[PDB]
Amino acid sequence: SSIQELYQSLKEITNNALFEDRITKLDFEKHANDIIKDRFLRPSNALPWSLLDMVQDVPYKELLKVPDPINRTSYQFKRTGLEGKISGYKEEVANASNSLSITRSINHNQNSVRGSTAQLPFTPGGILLHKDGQGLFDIPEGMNRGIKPMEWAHVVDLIPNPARSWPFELDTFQKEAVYHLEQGDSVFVAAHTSAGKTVVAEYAIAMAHRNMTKTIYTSPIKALSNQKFRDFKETFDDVNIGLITGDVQINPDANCLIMTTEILRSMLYRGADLIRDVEFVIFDEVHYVNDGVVWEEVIIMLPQHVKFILLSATVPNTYEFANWIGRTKQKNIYVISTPKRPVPLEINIWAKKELIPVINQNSEFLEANFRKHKEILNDGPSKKTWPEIVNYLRKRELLPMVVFVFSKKRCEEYADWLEGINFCNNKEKSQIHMFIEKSITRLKKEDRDLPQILKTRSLLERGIAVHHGGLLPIVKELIEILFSKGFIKVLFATETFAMGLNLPTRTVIFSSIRKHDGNGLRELTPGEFTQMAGRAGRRGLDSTGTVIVMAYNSPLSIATFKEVTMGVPTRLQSQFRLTYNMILNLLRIEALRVEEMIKYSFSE
């Protein structure tokens, strides 16, 4: 019975009027000679390799590459009359590995986003062997034998068809930046955080989209890239944005691309075709200083058709860097500075269950109140101090509040001392539970059951959370999104949370004014305090921003308090460095010698 008979027998199975796991009636278990004959004594037509081993025996002009032809003639179009239209044509008289020109041929086999070391970069913007014997060359170059046969920066004091419009009236510095971008050159804006520096970036992106070009948005921190991607996804219509990471590429052919500075530098050193159409590169958090911050190398290595928009905090060294960039790249750059903050900030001191203001709205110190503090008191938090402050702020309606603690363990320890305090209703708890459940559906049951997730979920459903660098990135993203939604009332955070992020808060509390970094405890610099304390007021929903510095059974020194709270702000510093990879790449390229790159730098 062949397969046809068996398949014909199958069709007799008639459907009748739940699934049942059935068991076959077939029995799988002297013709044993047929197997032996087929296995041990069957000659075959196909000779095995053993016999082929016995009967089989094994039996410069064409290795060269002839150069390809050359064409030097082309076509040119000559328009005629007003409103120029093509009237006539006339017959008139370089790869990635040969030329540094922007006009070299594009090879479609390689990646247009990342590139390769087989491609030379593009030209950065703004920057004997004859051993003849009897008449003929004999010694090649690099060997000892032949063949033996055998332009300024400007400071500004504070459009008919705008590319983007906003409901509210723009600030003076925003209008100045927009006008200078429209005129067709660079700007360098230094303003307080959350003062509206994103308007400039949005207008630059809209301008680039109007002109059929592209924009690159870079930041030195990879955590900010996802937040900026979501923000620009929500803000922008009719323009598509993408995200470039070390491995993942989202919308590579997008008008706006968000990446880090090191990714852009790696792209630049390998001659990626992406930079051909890029019009703007935006440098955010320029003031950031950590001992990935390679933006100066990017400035040096950029092509000459790219303009710059640099966003930074208030620093007193702006003109030096602006002048350096303008002189190096022969670009006109404008410096816009603004010290205005939309919500005034008041400095308080917490001592003996009393809030004592010491710096009023106009940044005036109060000596009498500091003396009152010092005499009233006459060291760290105890297990009964956080609930007192929390209840005090709930009574006066000063929530949400953020407490900055500079150690991973103490944040979680402090959060556990708030047991017995609840800030959520039934509907709020249900919504938080729903959001947490929907966020972790991409993980496995083993991943969903990690102790950190359970602990955070226990904390989140009461309006309390903890933010530090020892958490999983998904947990941190969940906490940030829930805080942005307005569900969290009390939060303990490290310096991770004090960088550019969405932070609607009404009160800021400092556990301490000393931070242990590197090797040794160190009192907070005025820049760190200014950035951290400058996030205490919501524009349009809060009248004032309350800042509380806590003293525990011991008066605070007036010298350190004055040095940290009101002192000379930090300056910009150059983080340019020399690396063996840098030198080796420059030597291999054989253009832009290292001495020239060094002499074109802020340090030199």
């Binding site: 199958l10 069709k11 729903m434 559906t441 496995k444």
Partner: protein, 384 residues
């Protein structure tokens, strides 16, 4: 296609192995060995169990292993949705899917389109050919156990509902004696490709029904392995992807259909040689643009390949613990064997806007059925 995020899943959806899956704009269809056919609503809302919006109908006691759905707007307002299935006994069945006006429940109506002489054959594979400006009538192609390919034309009207299937002709196997026809496909340009158990693919012209090419994909003819499991045409290009066995390995080979020449193969280092998967490749699927190919492996992985560069892009791993509702997790089978890494039977790309829900509104989706008797949905990160 680089990042894929799971959006919904349903463990223990069927009582037996889910052998095939198909999708349309309105719903997704599954067939299993228990003889049921399940329709899953594609327009889900936030916080909705997929099994809540599902409907099932019993077809054949012997079980089903192939399924395809055809949805089109045949007139100014008339809309027809047809489901074609084939069973283990070898029967070809047709069903009309319609929805109630008030309850919005799905109704199943059986159709009789094959004549008595046509019911004597045992069909294995099938594929709906929709109208794509090549000809005004929809097409249906099927293969049998004798190696023959059949082509029909579907006529919905004779607006009066009166469906009728008209046989165009048959194409015989290229070799004597005939072999088993394991897979079939039809392209938008009017081409038919058939795979055989010996490793041979034949291509014939839709209009005139005559053979064009006969290329052999066997690495070596030392043994009788290397059957063809899946043949797929590129959505717009002149490219044909072949999935074939290699003596316990899985291989994918690319051909161009204008002249029928070998282009290359996809392979990754696995625990040497040119193999795409560790165990076997059971299904293939192209995206809308025809630039990414997805292969479902018996080893329990979904691999994504770049067509132009013939290089792997990303890999998705399948686990039995990925099911949201923990009561639906099937850790072990009826014999106690592990299912921590279940093999994939079928994979399907869903067009943009077909599947709505948790952020899947403006990007392409993806569905797969695995050995743990589960159905899973994914979405591509970002937008388009």
């Amino acid at each position: 296609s680089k990042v894929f995020i799971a959006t919904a899943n349903a463990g223990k959806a069927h009582d037996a192995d889910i052998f095939s899956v198909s999708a349309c704009n309105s719903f997704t269809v599954s067939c299993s060995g228990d003889g049921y056919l399940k329709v899953w609503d594609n327009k889900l809302l936030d916080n909705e169990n997929p099994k809540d919006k599902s409907y099932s109908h019993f077809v054949h006691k012997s079980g089903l292993h192939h399924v395809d759905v055809l949805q089109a707007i045949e007139r100014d307002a008339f809309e027809l949705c047809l489901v074609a299935t084939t069973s283990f006994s070898g029967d070809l069945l047709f069903y009309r899917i319609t929805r109630e006006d008030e309850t919005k429940k799905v109704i199943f109506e059986k159709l009789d389109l094959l004549d008595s002489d046509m019911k004597k054959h045992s069909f294995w594979a099938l594929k709906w050919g929709a109208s794509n400006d090549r000809l005004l009538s929809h097409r249906l192609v099927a293969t049998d156990v004798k190696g023959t390919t059949y082509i029909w034309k579907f006529h919905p009207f004779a607006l009066n509902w009166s469906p009728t299937l008209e046989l165009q002709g048959t194409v015989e196997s290229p070799m004597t004696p005939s072999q088993f026809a394991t897979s079939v496909d039809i392209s938008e340009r009017g081409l038919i490709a058939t795979g055989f158990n010996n490793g041979t693919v034949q291509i014939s012209e839709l209009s005139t029904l005559r053979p064009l090419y006969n290329f052999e994909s066997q690495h070596s003819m030392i043994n009788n392995s290397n059957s063809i499991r899946s043949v797929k045409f590129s959505p717009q290009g002149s490219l044909l992807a072949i999935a074939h066995d290699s003596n316990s390995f899985g291989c994918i080979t690319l051909y161009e259909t204008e002249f029928g020449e070998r282009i290359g193969s996809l392979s990754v280092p696995t625990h040497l040689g040119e193999f795409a998967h560790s165990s076997w490749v059971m299904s293939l699927s192209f995206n809308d643009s025809g630039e990414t190919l997805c292969s479902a492996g018996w080893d329990g992985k979904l691999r994504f390949w770049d067509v132009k560069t013939k290089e792997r892009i990303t890999t998705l791993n399948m686990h039995c613990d990925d099911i949201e509702i923990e009561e639906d997790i099937l850790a072990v089978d009826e014999h106690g064997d592990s299912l921590a890494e279940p093999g994939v039977f079928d994979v399907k790309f869903l067009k943009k806007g077909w599947r709505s829900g948790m952020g899947a509104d403006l990007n392409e989706s993806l569905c797969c059925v695995c050995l743990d008797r589960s159905i899973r949905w994914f979405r591509e990160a970002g937008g388009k």
